[PDB]
Amino acid sequence: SGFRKMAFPSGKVEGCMVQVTCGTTTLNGLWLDDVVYCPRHVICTSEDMLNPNYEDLLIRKSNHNFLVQAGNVQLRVIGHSMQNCVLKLKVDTANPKTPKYKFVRIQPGQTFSVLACYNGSPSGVYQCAMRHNFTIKGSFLNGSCGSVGFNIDYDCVSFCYMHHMELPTGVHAGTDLEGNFYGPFVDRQTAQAAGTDTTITVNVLAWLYAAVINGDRWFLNRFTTTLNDFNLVAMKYNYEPLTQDHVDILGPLSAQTGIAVLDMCASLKELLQNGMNGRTILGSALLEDEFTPFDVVRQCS
Amino acid sequence: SGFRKMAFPSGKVEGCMVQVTCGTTTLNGLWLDDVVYCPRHVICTSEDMLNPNYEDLLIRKSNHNFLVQAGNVQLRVIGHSMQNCVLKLKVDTANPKTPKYKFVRIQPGQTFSVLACYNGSPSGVYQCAMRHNFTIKGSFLNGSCGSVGFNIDYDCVSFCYMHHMELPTGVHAGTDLEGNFYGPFVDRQTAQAAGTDTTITVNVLAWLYAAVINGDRWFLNRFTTTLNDFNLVAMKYNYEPLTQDHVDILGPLSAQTGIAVLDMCASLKELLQNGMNGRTILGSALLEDEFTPFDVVRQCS
C-alpha cells in the first residue's frame, strides 16, 4: 500500500551526464554512444545571451573550443553541429555506459522523471508532468541547464526533455532531445510568459482511483453524471474536458475498483463544488493532477 | 526556483540489489563487498511466518538452501549468519559495483530516499521521512521486502532502512542495516499497531522558509511570538515542541530570508489557527513536514 511521487531509478541516466564548457559558459550534457547533446546556449558569451544569432556564433567555433568532462576524464571533441536548439558534439570515445535509448516527444499531461544535474554531476531525481501550456513545474537552480527528463520501459530509456531555462513565474521550459522547444519559447533572454494552464482531468480521476485502491473512500457517492454535465462543470473550474478516450483509458482502474468512470466523475464534481472540508486524499488537501493512469497502475498493481 | 520531493540519484544503490530465495520464499537483498544482507523472514515457509523461532529455522538451513541472483548471475553462498532481524549471506564474489558506504541509524524527523525493488529489480525511487512513531509512509507492494532507504553524501551511501512489513494502517516498518527495528515492531505476523504520531515542527518551519525563498509570502505577518507561547499552540495541534536547538538549526534559512525564526513561528501559529483560506504554499494545501532544514538548503541554495 501507499502512494508516492515516484521517479524511475536514475542510474542508467547518471552514467551519461557530462559537463560541457565553451569559454566561461558551462552547463550539463548527455553522452550517448560517441555524441554529447547539450543546449546550444552554451556557445553564448555573457554579451551574446540577450539576442544571439546562433548560426553566426557556431560558425566562429572550432572543436577545440568545447571542453567536455566526464568525471575527471576529458573527452576529445572531433566534430560539432547544431540541431534546432541542441548542439551535438561528436567525441572520440563512445560512452561505455550507454543504455538502450530512444528520443521521444511527450504530450501535455504525461509524466517523466527529471535528473537534476550541476557541473555534470547528478544531484537529485523527481517526477514532473508536462503542463497544458508546455511548461514543467520543476526544481532547478543556476547551472541545471542540460539536465534531462526521461521514462524507462524494459531497460530502454526514452529521453523526452532537456532543460533550458526558467520563466519569470518560476516554471521551466526546455526542448525534446531533437532540440525542438516544448511550447512557444525561444532560447534567448527575453521575458517570455507561459500561456494559461488547465488541470489535467484524466490524471485527477486516475489519482482518485489510486485513493480508492489505497482505502480512501470518503469522497465516493451513489450519484452519477453524464460526460457532458461533468464537462460543463469542468469548464467552470478550468479542468480539461474529459473525452471518451479518457474514459476508455480509465477502464482498467474502474474494473479493479468496481467504480464506473462516470461515477467517479460525479465524485469529482462534488469535490470541485464543495471542496474537501478539512479532509485529505492520499495525504493531500488538493486534487492532484500529475499522476497518469499508467503511473497509478504501476504503483498500485 | 521550484521545490519538489527530491530523492538522491539511485544508481549507486541499484548496483547492489539482488534477489534472495529460500525454498519458495523470496525477497530483495543488498550485496556489498562479499556479503548479501536481507530480512531474515526469508527463511520462513508459509507455515512458519505467523510465529517463527528464527534460531531454530536458521540452524536447520545450510548454504545451499539460499539462492542469490544478481541479474542472471547466480551467486554462490559460502556462509550464513543472523544479525538481529537481518540475515548475512557470505558469497564467493565481491560486488564490483560496491560504493563507499556506511550503515547509519536515523532519527524521527530525518528523511531518506527509498529504492523500491521487486525480484531484485529496482522499480522506483522516492523520498520518505521517519515518523515520530518510527513508521514510514512509503509506497510498497508485495515483494518489496528488502528494499533499502539511504542518503548520499560525497559518493558515500549511508544506508539507514531496510523494509520488512506493512502494518494494518498501511504504513511501513523496518530495520536499520544492523537488523534492529525502528520502533516497537517484530518480524512476525501479528496485528501490530503504530503508536501515535506528531507533526515534525522544525520541518514545517523549514518548508515555510523554502516557500519564502521561492516567492510565496502571503502567510507572513508582522506578528511575533515567544517559544513557549508557540509551543502552547503546537501542543494543541499535535505538533512536536520546538526547542532552542531547532531554532538554532533554522539559523541559516532565517539569515538568507531575513525572517527571524520566532517570526516564522508566529506565521505558523496563525496558519494552525485559521487554516489557509483556499490558498496554497509551494503547491500544497496543507503544512508539509517531510522536508528537513538540510533538504531545503540543498534544493534552494
Ligand SMILES: COCCOc1cncc(-n2c(=O)[nH]/c(=N\c3cc4cn(C)nc4cc3Cl)n(Cc3cc(C#N)ccc3C)c2=O)c1
Ligand atoms: C532560484 O533560481 C533561479 C534560477 O534558476 C534556474 C533554473 N533553470 C535554469 C536557469 N538558467 C541557468 O541556470 N542558466 C542560464 N543561462 C546560463 C548562464 C551562465 C553563466 N555561465 C558562466 N554559464 C552559463 C550557462 C547558462 Cl545556460 N539560464 C538562462 C538560459 C539558459 C538556456 C540554456 N540551456 C537558454 C536560454 C537562457 C535565457 C537559465 O534560465 C536558472
Ligand SMILES: COCCOc1cncc(-n2c(=O)[nH]/c(=N\c3cc4cn(C)nc4cc3Cl)n(Cc3cc(C#N)ccc3C)c2=O)c1
Ligand atoms: C497493497 O499492498 C499491501 C501489501 O504491501 C506490502 C508492503 N510491504 C511489505 C509487504 N509484505 C510482503 O511483501 N511480504 C511479506 N511476507 C512475505 C510473503 C512471501 C510469499 N512468498 C512466496 N515469499 C514471501 C516473502 C515475504 Cl517477506 N510481508 C509480511 C512480512 C515480511 C517480513 C520481511 N521482510 C517480515 C515479517 C512479515 C509479517 C509483507 O508485509 C506487503
